[PDB]
Amino acid sequence: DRSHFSLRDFFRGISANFELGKDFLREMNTPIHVSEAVFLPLSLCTLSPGRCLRLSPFGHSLTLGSHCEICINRSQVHVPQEFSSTQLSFFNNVHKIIPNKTFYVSLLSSSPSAVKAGLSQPSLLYAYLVTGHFCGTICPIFSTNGKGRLIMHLLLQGTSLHIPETCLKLLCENIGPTYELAVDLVGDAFCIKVSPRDTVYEKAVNVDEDAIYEAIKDLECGDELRLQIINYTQLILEN
Amino acid sequence: MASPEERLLDELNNVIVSFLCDSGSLEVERCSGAHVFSRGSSQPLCTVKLRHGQIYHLEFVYKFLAFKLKNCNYPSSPVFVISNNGLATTLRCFLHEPSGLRSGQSGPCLGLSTDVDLPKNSIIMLGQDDFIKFKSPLVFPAELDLLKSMVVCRAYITEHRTTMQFLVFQAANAQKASRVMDMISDMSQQLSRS
Ligand SMILES: [Zn+2]
């Protein structure tokens, strides 16, 4: 009786009344494998386009935006900000030196004469701003590679961090190609490394120069930031 | 009337309009040409525009079309062609494999995968047994049949990149799905065969 239910019987019964086929389509509502485990380190560039990152100390998983509970409960629209153009956002919030203080603090603390090389790359600020927007207060760190181009290590303060889909989209799409984006964790916490794509690609420029150096006026370094930045620089040197 | 061909074409278009996308306005361009049936066809039964975020029940529609065609003693099996023309992504439903072959015709006939980047002037070609090949390594043997595991295509269309995300849907309430299947079996048993 129930046996012998060929596909033909199914499609015939539906052809009788399309509403039964709609009922069937309605019941098949759950995707099979939304969540995909991922292990560190991970090159974010070489990543599928729409995916959230649910990084946590015990495990590190990657899920899809459509079925990301945290990205769904919160206002899915959230706050669409105009960060679309790298250069636009650079010259938009270089004025906000009262915020973004940690970024300027780290580059200044290094004062290697490569503060010029940090200013030369506007991509850096873009990363910081967006990582600050969607993923809370960041702790910037700047290191010197054999290449004149400085490498950046933005550290994120979090036991379990939820990197949203829109953030990864912005980063990979607007800055991705020009600078290698990667994620790894130092002792205290996870971090996003912004790097130059070897020496194959150098792009964009501007030179405010001393205009910004007179501006920084060597603002005070909070001892909390002082300890964090010092320890993280030491630990980077150990890597 | 020309019901032998016209009526069949109309029914197929109605199927695609009714079951492809569960909700929303479906931008479909129907074809009014007998060349649909002629071998080596370059013209589709229907061309459907693809919108970001919407879910398109591809496999159900495909298997339903194949059933209707085999009922009408049409030998060939359908073929779906999802392509990026630069302006929009289009799903074209050809009843038989077109003439645009693998031999340097446009951007390669990209195969199925979880995520497929679909650049401009590139195509994806879905055939008769591609769905089962795609579902084989993702579900257990009992689940391979469409009655339990359905393939669908979501569109991730952004101005900076367009990507096709192929997914596999199952029923959560297996008991309720069984009840719906019972309804369908009752309807089939009541209707008369040849
Ligand atoms: Zn998310």
Residue numbers in the entry:
A (entry chain B): 78 to 316
B (entry chain A): 1 to 194
Question: What text comes from the article?
Answer:
For crystallization, we designed a construct EBV NEC195Δ65 composed of residues 1–195 of BFRF1 and residues 66–318 of BFLF2, which is similar to those of previously crystallized NEC homologs. This construct lacks the membrane-proximal regions (MPRs) in both BFRF1 and BFLF2 as well as the TM anchor of BFRF1. The structure was refined to 3.97 Å resolution (Rwork = 27.0%, Rfree = 30.8%). Like its counterparts in alpha- and betaherpesviruses, the EBV NEC resembles an elongated cylinder that is composed of the globular BFRF1 pedestal topped with the globular C-terminal domain of BFLF2 and the N-terminal two-helix “hook” of BFLF2 that wraps around the BFRF1 pedestal. The conserved CCCH-type Zn-binding site, formed by three cysteines and one histidine, is located at the base of the globular domain. Importantly, EBV NEC crystals contain five independent, structurally distinct heterodimers in the asymmetric unit. BFLF2 interacts with BFRF1 at two interfaces, the so-called “primary” or hook-in-groove interface that involves the BFLF2 hook, and the “secondary” or globular interface, which involves the globular domain of BFLF2. Across the five EBV NEC heterodimers, the globular domains of BFLF2 adopt distinct orientations relative to BFRF1 where they are either more or less tilted towards the BFRF1/hook module, as measured by the angles between D10BFRF1/P98BFRF1/D287BFLF2. We attribute the differences in tilt across the EBV NEC heterodimers to the differences in the interactions at the globular domain interface, specifically, the presence or the absence of the distal hydrogen bond between T158BFRF1 and E250BFLF2.
During replication, herpesviral capsids are translocated from the nucleus into the cytoplasm by an unusual mechanism, termed nuclear egress, that involves capsid budding at the inner nuclear membrane. Capsid budding at the INM requires the viral nuclear egress complex (NEC), a heterodimer of two conserved viral proteins: UL31, a soluble nuclear phosphoprotein, and UL34, which contains a single C-terminal transmembrane (TM) helix that anchors the NEC in the INM. Here, we report the crystal structure of the NEC from Epstein-Barr virus (EBV), a prototypical gammaherpesvirus. Here, we show that the purified, recombinant EBV NEC vesiculates synthetic lipid membranes in vitro and forms membrane-bound coats, which suggests that the intrinsic membrane budding ability is a conserved property of the NECs across Herpesviridae.
